[PDB]
Swiss-Prot record:
It comes from the Eukaryota. The TPR repeat-binding motif mediates interaction with TPR repeat-containing proteins like the co-chaperone STUB1. ISGylated. S-nitrosylated; negatively regulates the ATPase activity and the activation of eNOS by HSP90AA1. The modification N6-acetyllysine is found at K43, K69. ATP binds at N36, D78, K97, F123. Homodimer. Identified in NR3C1/GCR steroid receptor-chaperone complexes formed at least by NR3C1, HSP90AA1 and a variety of proteins containing TPR repeats such as FKBP4, FKBP5, PPID, PPP5C or STIP1. Forms a complex containing HSP90AA1, TSC1 and TSC2; TSC1 is required to recruit TCS2 to the complex. The closed form interacts (via the middle domain and TPR repeat-binding motif) with co-chaperone TSC1 (via C-terminus). Interacts with TOM34. Interacts with TERT; the interaction, together with PTGES3, is required for correct assembly and stabilization of the TERT holoenzyme complex. (Microbial infection) Interacts with herpes simplex virus 1 protein US11; this interaction inhibits TBK1-induced interferon production. This is Heat shock protein HSP 90-alpha. Residues 1-208 are annotated as: Interaction with NR3C1. It is found in: Nucleus; Cytoplasm; Melanosome; Cell membrane. The chain holds residues 16 to 223 of 732 of the full protein.
Amino acid sequence: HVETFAFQAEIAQLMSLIINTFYSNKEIFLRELISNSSDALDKIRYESLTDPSKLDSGKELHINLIPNKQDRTLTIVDTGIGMTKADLINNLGTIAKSGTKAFMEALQAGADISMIGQFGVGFYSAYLVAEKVTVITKHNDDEQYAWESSAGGSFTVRTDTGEPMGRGTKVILHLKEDQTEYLEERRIKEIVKKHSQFIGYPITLFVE
Ligand SMILES: C#CCCCn1c(Cc2cc(OC)ccc2OC)nc2c(N)nc(F)nc21
């Protein structure tokens, strides 16, 4: 079964700002997702230092960037710590509430969209370029889930029956029709080089 959840008002509001504000420098979404993956990889690495078995679900600590013109998706895959059901439904919302408030405050003082990551809500920059985001995630202590939202005030969570991923998180960006440049190899390489060149994990850009 699919469960449907309301975003808290603040998140819905930040999602609408991101979708509605005129802002041409959309490419920043990518480094925010990469940065999130790098935090999650840092987290499982740290946890394995005292418990090597946290890596039984996979030892490779990496990020793949997967474009698919047929589906119109750009997928960011990591083998980081992953999110539990409790994360998806409760903790993210808690974290994202305070972070939205500070971000929205900062925008008044003429901060801009590109600083979203400093407030722990960079994930929502996905909506600069994606009409829909699907997040598939697997934590050691929990089942594989799929989160999804097209914004509009709600998100769904379900257990995922797709290919098991081991451990980690995939963020599938269903791109808007006018954002297919982010399916292009040279475009992705250009962005990664400019904003993400010093990440402490291998980034593989898949080709089609
Ligand atoms: C809990 C918490 C904060 C981190 C949540 N998170 C994020 C950020 C995030 C992910 C998300 O997915 C639906 C929704 C909101 C959101 O930010 C507030 N990306 C990842 C990721 N790649 N791997 C793991 F393990 N966790 C992630």
